Design a protein around this ligand. Structure first.
Ligand SMILES: [Mg+2]
Ligand SMILES: [Mg+2]
Ligand SMILES: [Mg+2]
Ligand SMILES: [Mg+2]
Ligand SMILES: [Mg+2]
Ligand SMILES: [Mg+2]
Ligand SMILES: [Mg+2]
Lengths: 118, 82, 25, 70, 181
RNA sequence: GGCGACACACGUGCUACAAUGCCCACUACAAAGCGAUGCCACCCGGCAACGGGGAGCUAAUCGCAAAAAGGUGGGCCCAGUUCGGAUUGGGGUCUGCAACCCGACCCCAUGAAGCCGGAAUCGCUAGUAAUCGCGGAUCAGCCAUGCCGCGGUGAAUACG
RNA sequence: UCGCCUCCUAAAAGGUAACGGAGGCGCCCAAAGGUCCCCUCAGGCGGGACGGAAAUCCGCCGGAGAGCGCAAGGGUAGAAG
């Protein structure tokens, strides 16, 4: 069911199916279905349409999620555009933000190795 | 990350506040990021020390929890052969 | 998941406690 | 024209928040989650959040500790 | 003559409003929305027809009218394809069907678009016409999601008897064209 | 301010790629050591880190600690997946005069690479290898996945 | 180099030479043929998801600069396309 921006997860437990949304994770998941009052271990296969409506209405509202909060997150990094701080430059150069070790490692932001040789 | 303290340098503020009544001149230095962005005197320039010299940083809202020296990189890097 | 900060197992390995590992009872 | 195109039946279609008509198309009635002409998201404007600004809150969060005040 | 809510909404609301906004002196000087033509740039079907047919019936479902294949005018070795080769579908629809499509477009499809802050107000022709791009085609109520194979889109041209791109800016604004301010 | 720089190369390691596995709940079974300029039972607030109280203990008396792997129950059903946790946004806490460069945790949301490793290369012959947690030194705090110890379950094979 | 085609030399009819200046041909098409009926290009400026100097789409402007199986000339949309 097209809950937020997504619909994908069929026969696979609503507490888990919920996770498949940028903004839900695991904590907001069971938090949303206990506050909506729905059984977590259900089929996800389009069960009681009412439960699905209530779920959708609560989840999609309340807190920001999916493409909207991706925009906000990207905009929070755009904050350090202008004449920003040190943390912005780390987002500029493509290097790790939290001042860690970059002599080795840091491949998750630098990307795969390039090898200079000399 | 402080919560009940949330401090700024007393000496930075002394110089900053007694030069805040009805206006001033942007000629104001420091020697400590340690402080915090300080609201009021936003339209100001604080020459922060980066270990070598005093870099004129400018305040235009937008900044807060970022004290000073984040606006004063201490290294240079610039490039690695390329 | 000895390095995940959201498990009783990772909380053991890290040492610290929390929500995913309460200080007993 | 004759003997190729799909036909267009009368009107009925279900919205996730209320009602919708017209339909025609091919199907008698279909389901639509994100409703349209109703109200949500740029249809009367429902400001979900506001995206906090630092000039406001962070000057009153860091400034909540008014120990640095004056 | 069918009926169509948008069609009525044009006559008994949008129509007199234009005579007030612009002060046309004749019943024909008023902008009349006519001819909406859907086009799909189908390079994807550079060398495939079973990917083109699937795009045909898909289009036939949302407009209630079979599309016609367009063929390459010349030949561009820079990106394959020769003189022939079915590269692109296109269906023209005016009257009745144009309105039934335009309703489900504005009042179902367009809001079903991810985020979507509103149609571009600079996307106007200069002779009173409008065009708009679309990514996913699943945003149409007749598309069932679990029956697709590829996310192919379409270009949409809405032709109008207006002169300036202001009288059309107005005409569509009244019909329900969200313009992101 | 720097030793924490980063287009890169090597060493020693940690965590993994899952179902003899992962999550949650319940429920057992250690040893060796450390502590009243500290360890802090038990209550109270808090989702939690932690904060408010506050008893006992110069300590085979009180406290750090419930050991964990195990067992029982239940849930996932093999899918980059309830595997994996990197990276990043936000919100907090504690030490400290102060944690931007450069601290450790907590919580919400993201969830990357990896589906088992080329040429090569290491360790171990009995409580041994493997695997599991526990203490201590330094130490305000901590970048400890290290070092020095402690016990838990416990192989395989040696013709020559 | 030797035969055929196209343009120039060629002196406003035709024709006209040089071991003068430039290019082509030794095929191809059962549709690229017959007829009847329809339709009009190249470009330029806007508008348009992927899609860019060019793919298809809409809108104006655009008399022929397109096209006409291959050289070149003539011819040609009131068609030969
Ligand atoms: Mg060093
Ligand atoms: Mg991969
Ligand atoms: Mg696998
Ligand atoms: Mg031996
Ligand atoms: Mg002559
Ligand atoms: Mg003559
Ligand atoms: Mg001659």
């Amino acid at each position: 069911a097209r809950i937020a921006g997504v619909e994908i997860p069929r026969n696979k437990r609503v507490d888990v199916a919920l996770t498949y949304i940028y903004g839900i994770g695991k904590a907001r998941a069971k938090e949303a279905l206990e506050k909506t009052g729905i059984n977590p271990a259900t089929r996800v296969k389009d069960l009681t349409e009412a439960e699905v409506v209530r779920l959708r209405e609560y989840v999609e509202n309340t807190w920001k999620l999916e493409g909207e909060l991706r925009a906000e997150v990207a905009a929070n990094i755009k904050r350090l555009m202008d004449i920003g701080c040190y943390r912005g430059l780390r987002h500029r150069r493509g290097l790790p933000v939290r001042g860690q070790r970059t002599r080795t490692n840091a491949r998750t932001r630098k990307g795969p190795r390039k090898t200079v040789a000399g | 990350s402080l919560k009940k303290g949330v401090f700024v340098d007393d000496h930075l503020l002394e110089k900053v506040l007694e030069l805040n009544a009805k206006g001033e001149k942007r000629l104001i230095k420091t020697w400590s990021r340690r402080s915090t962005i300080v609201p009021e005197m936003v339209g100001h320039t604080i020459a922060v020390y980066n270990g070598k010299q005093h870099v004129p940083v400018y305040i235009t809202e937008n900044m807060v929890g970022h004290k000073l020296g984040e606006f004063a990189p201490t290294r240079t890097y610039r490039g690695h052969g390329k | 998941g000895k390095g995940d900060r959201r498990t009783r197992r990772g909380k053991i390995w890290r040492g610290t406690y929390g929500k995913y590992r309460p200080r007993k009872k | 024209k004759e003997g190729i195109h799909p036909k267009l039946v009368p009107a009925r279609i279900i919205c996730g928040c209320g009602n919708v008509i017209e339909t025609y198309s091919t199907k008698p009635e279909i389901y639509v989650e994100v409703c349209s002409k109703c109200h949500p998201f740029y249809t009367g404007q429902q400001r979900f959040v506001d995206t906090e600004g630092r000039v406001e809150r962070f000057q009153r969060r860091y400034g909540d500790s008014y120990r640095k005040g004056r | 003559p069918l009926d169509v809510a948008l069609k009525r909404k044009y006559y008994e609301e949008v129509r007199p409003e234009l005579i007030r906004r612009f002060g046309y002196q004749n019943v024909w000087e008023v902008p009349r929305l006519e001819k909406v033509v859907i086009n799909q740039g189908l390079g994807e079907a550079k060398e495939d027809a079973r990917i083109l047919e699937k795009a045909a019936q898909e289009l036939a479902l949302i407009t209630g009218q079979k599309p016609a294949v367009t063929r390459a005018k010349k030949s561009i070795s820079n990106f394959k394809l020769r003189k022939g080769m079915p590269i692109g579908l296109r269906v023209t629809l005016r009257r009745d069907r144009m309105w039934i499509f335009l309703e489900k477009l504005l009042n179902v499809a367009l809001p079903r678009i991810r985020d979507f802050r509103g149609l571009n107000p600079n996307s106007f022709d200069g002779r009173g016409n409008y065009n708009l791009g679309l990514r996913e085609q699943l945003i149409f109520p007749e598309i069932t999601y679990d029956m697709v194979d590829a996310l192919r889109g379409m270009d949409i041209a809405v032709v109008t008897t207006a002169e300036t791109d202001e009288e059309a800016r107005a005409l569509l604004e009244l019909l329900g064209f969200p313009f992101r301010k």
